[PDB]
Write an enzyme that holds these catalytic residues in place. Structure first.
Site, PDB file in Angstrom:
ATOM      1  N   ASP A  29     -21.538   2.011 -31.374  1.00  0.00           N
ATOM      2  CA  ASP A  29     -20.403   1.769 -32.343  1.00  0.00           C
ATOM      3  C   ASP A  29     -19.273   2.174 -31.529  1.00  0.00           C
ATOM      4  O   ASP A  29     -19.132   3.460 -30.919  1.00  0.00           O
ATOM      5  CB  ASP A  29     -20.561   2.336 -33.586  1.00  0.00           C
ATOM      6  CG  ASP A  29     -19.651   1.823 -34.804  1.00  0.00           C
ATOM      7  OD1 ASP A  29     -18.704   1.022 -34.248  1.00  0.00           O
ATOM      8  OD2 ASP A  29     -19.746   2.210 -35.699  1.00  0.00           O
TER       9      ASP A  29
ATOM     10  N   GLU B 254     -28.780   2.804 -34.881  1.00  0.00           N
ATOM     11  CA  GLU B 254     -28.087   2.482 -36.373  1.00  0.00           C
ATOM     12  C   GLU B 254     -28.879   1.968 -37.069  1.00  0.00           C
ATOM     13  O   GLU B 254     -29.423   2.635 -38.236  1.00  0.00           O
ATOM     14  CB  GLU B 254     -26.819   1.423 -36.108  1.00  0.00           C
ATOM     15  CG  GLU B 254     -25.587   2.181 -35.547  1.00  0.00           C
ATOM     16  CD  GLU B 254     -24.662   1.367 -34.790  1.00  0.00           C
ATOM     17  OE1 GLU B 254     -24.883   0.533 -33.803  1.00  0.00           O
ATOM     18  OE2 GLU B 254     -23.469   1.373 -35.170  1.00  0.00           O
TER      19      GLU B 254
ATOM     20  N   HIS C   5     -22.413 -10.430 -36.099  1.00  0.00           N
ATOM     21  CA  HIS C   5     -21.974  -9.262 -36.748  1.00  0.00           C
ATOM     22  C   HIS C   5     -22.568  -8.230 -36.131  1.00  0.00           C
ATOM     23  O   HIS C   5     -23.488  -8.078 -35.398  1.00  0.00           O
ATOM     24  CB  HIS C   5     -22.574  -9.333 -38.173  1.00  0.00           C
ATOM     25  CG  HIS C   5     -24.089  -9.129 -38.286  1.00  0.00           C
ATOM     26  ND1 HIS C   5     -24.478  -7.743 -38.293  1.00  0.00           N
ATOM     27  CD2 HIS C   5     -24.725  -9.916 -38.685  1.00  0.00           C
ATOM     28  CE1 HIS C   5     -25.603  -8.049 -38.842  1.00  0.00           C
ATOM     29  NE2 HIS C   5     -26.138  -9.126 -38.926  1.00  0.00           N
ATOM     30  N   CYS C   6     -21.838  -6.986 -36.559  1.00  0.00           N
ATOM     31  CA  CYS C   6     -22.359  -5.690 -36.004  1.00  0.00           C
ATOM     32  C   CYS C   6     -22.409  -4.621 -37.250  1.00  0.00           C
ATOM     33  O   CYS C   6     -23.236  -5.071 -37.819  1.00  0.00           O
ATOM     34  CB  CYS C   6     -21.252  -5.414 -35.043  1.00  0.00           C
ATOM     35  SG  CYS C   6     -19.380  -5.153 -35.503  1.00  0.00           S
TER      36      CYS C   6
ATOM     37  N   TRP D  50     -25.519  -1.225 -27.546  1.00  0.00           N
ATOM     38  CA  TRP D  50     -24.031  -1.377 -27.719  1.00  0.00           C
ATOM     39  C   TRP D  50     -23.526  -0.402 -28.716  1.00  0.00           C
ATOM     40  O   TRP D  50     -23.478  -0.661 -29.890  1.00  0.00           O
ATOM     41  CB  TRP D  50     -23.390  -2.575 -27.962  1.00  0.00           C
ATOM     42  CG  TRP D  50     -21.869  -2.656 -27.727  1.00  0.00           C
ATOM     43  CD1 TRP D  50     -20.987  -1.672 -27.630  1.00  0.00           C
ATOM     44  CD2 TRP D  50     -21.208  -3.901 -27.663  1.00  0.00           C
ATOM     45  NE1 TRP D  50     -19.611  -2.204 -27.411  1.00  0.00           N
ATOM     46  CE2 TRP D  50     -19.758  -3.493 -27.317  1.00  0.00           C
ATOM     47  CE3 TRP D  50     -21.392  -5.179 -27.837  1.00  0.00           C
ATOM     48  CZ2 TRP D  50     -18.753  -4.605 -27.315  1.00  0.00           C
ATOM     49  CZ3 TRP D  50     -20.215  -6.188 -27.598  1.00  0.00           C
ATOM     50  CH2 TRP D  50     -18.816  -5.844 -27.385  1.00  0.00           C
TER      51      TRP D  50
ATOM     52  N   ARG E  47     -17.113  -4.617 -32.603  1.00  0.00           N
ATOM     53  CA  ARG E  47     -18.006  -5.331 -31.259  1.00  0.00           C
ATOM     54  C   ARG E  47     -17.940  -6.630 -31.549  1.00  0.00           C
ATOM     55  O   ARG E  47     -18.018  -7.344 -30.549  1.00  0.00           O
ATOM     56  CB  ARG E  47     -19.325  -4.469 -31.285  1.00  0.00           C
ATOM     57  CG  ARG E  47     -19.596  -3.115 -30.863  1.00  0.00           C
ATOM     58  CD  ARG E  47     -20.800  -2.235 -31.041  1.00  0.00           C
ATOM     59  NE  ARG E  47     -21.035  -2.029 -32.478  1.00  0.00           N
ATOM     60  CZ  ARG E  47     -21.830  -1.119 -33.184  1.00  0.00           C
ATOM     61  NH1 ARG E  47     -22.805  -0.801 -32.548  1.00  0.00           N
ATOM     62  NH2 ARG E  47     -21.902  -0.992 -34.352  1.00  0.00           N
ATOM     63  N   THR E  48     -18.026  -7.075 -32.950  1.00  0.00           N
ATOM     64  CA  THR E  48     -17.844  -8.735 -33.220  1.00  0.00           C
ATOM     65  C   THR E  48     -16.653  -9.147 -32.559  1.00  0.00           C
ATOM     66  O   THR E  48     -16.506 -10.273 -31.962  1.00  0.00           O
ATOM     67  CB  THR E  48     -17.894  -8.743 -34.611  1.00  0.00           C
ATOM     68  OG1 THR E  48     -19.136  -8.435 -35.345  1.00  0.00           O
ATOM     69  CG2 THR E  48     -17.508 -10.244 -35.111  1.00  0.00           C
TER      70      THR E  48
END
EC number: 3.1.3.48
Length: 283
Positions: free
Chosen positions: A171, A105, A217-218, A169, A224-225
């Site tokens: 999204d 990302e 934070h993601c 991880w 994910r947060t």
């Protein structure tokens, strides 16, 4: 009657759903922080920030508290929001920043997600210096990279923040319970070693309840947060009896109705719950 059956979980979804529909932002909604001046505030037009728990006026971030557990959830800062993002990090004397946005990302320029914690940089008056330290395996192939961000601003006290970065991880997915509980603990443990450092130093930020909170934070900060925050909340003995329903309802009322985005991420918090004999629903 099994508190975790098909039926019970069906009831949980009804409630939680009505809440998301109800919390959806309207145009110029007064419940949500609005972008001032035309400058862009929101990474995604629709993932909004509750005005009341808003941390700063120019970030999409929120003070959250589920039970006795206090943290700050946010979105990945847009490039133009970095000097404030660092400011918040410094003023909160952050015991730890957990970042759940993957390396693919951040790598992809189309997403406009600056690589702010993996290298040195100068933003306005704030200069930052990153330095990689350990790297921990959480299980199932998941891996956490650890760093130390030193934040310097002229005239200000220099502050360093320990970063924990789960680079893989994806999204819209949920890591399993075990990797999740494994991650939650690694975040709590890092938190205390640093809280303890300010404590033995006499820092007054220890008294204060708006400070020393884990910032997580993601990408959008609702997916994910949330799942991580729901597992840190469950690691606290103090948060006893607090069901999944309340847990989800407090995150959603204090940020937006998208907290715990996918039904699989929710399955994870339902797994941890079942494992402690913790209730799903209220009453």
């Amino acid at each position: 009657v099994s508190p975790y059956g098909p039926e019970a979980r069906a009831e949980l979804s009804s409630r939680l759903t009505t809440l998301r529909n109800t919390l959806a932002p309207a145009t110029n909604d007064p419940r949500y922080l609005q972008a001032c001046g035309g400058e862009k505030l929101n990474r995604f037009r629709d993932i909004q920030c509750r005005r009341q728990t808003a941390v700063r006026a120019d970030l999409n971030a929120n003070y959250i508290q589920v039970g006795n557990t206090r943290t700050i959830a946010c979105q990945y800062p847009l490039q133009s929001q970095l000097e404030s993002h660092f400011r918040m990090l410094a003023e909160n004397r952050t015991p730890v920043l957990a970042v759940l946005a993957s390396s693919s990302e951040i790598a992809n320029q189309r997403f406009g997600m600056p690589d702010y914690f993996r290298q040195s940089g100068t933003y306005g008056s704030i200069t930052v210096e990153s330095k990689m330290t350990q790297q921990v395996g959480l299980g199932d192939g998941i891996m956490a990279d650890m760093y130390t961000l030193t934040i310097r601003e002229a005239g200000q006290k220099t502050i360093s923040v320990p970063v924990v970065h789960v680079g893989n991880w994806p999204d819209q997915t949920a890591v399993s319970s075990e990797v999740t509980k494994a991650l939650a603990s690694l975040v709590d443990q890092t938190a205390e070693t640093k809280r303890n450092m300010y404590e033995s130093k006499g820092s007054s930020a220890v008294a204060d309840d708006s400070k020393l909170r884990p910032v997580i934070h993601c990408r959008a900060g609702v997916g994910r947060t949330a799942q991580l925050i729901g597992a840190m909340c469950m690691n606290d003995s103090r948060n006893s009896q607090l069901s999944v329903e309340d847990m989800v309802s407090q995150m959603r009322v204090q940020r937006n109705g998208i907290m715990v985005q996918k039904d699989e991420q929710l399955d994870v918090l339902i797994k941890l719950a079942e494992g402690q004999g913790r209730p799903l629903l209220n009453s």
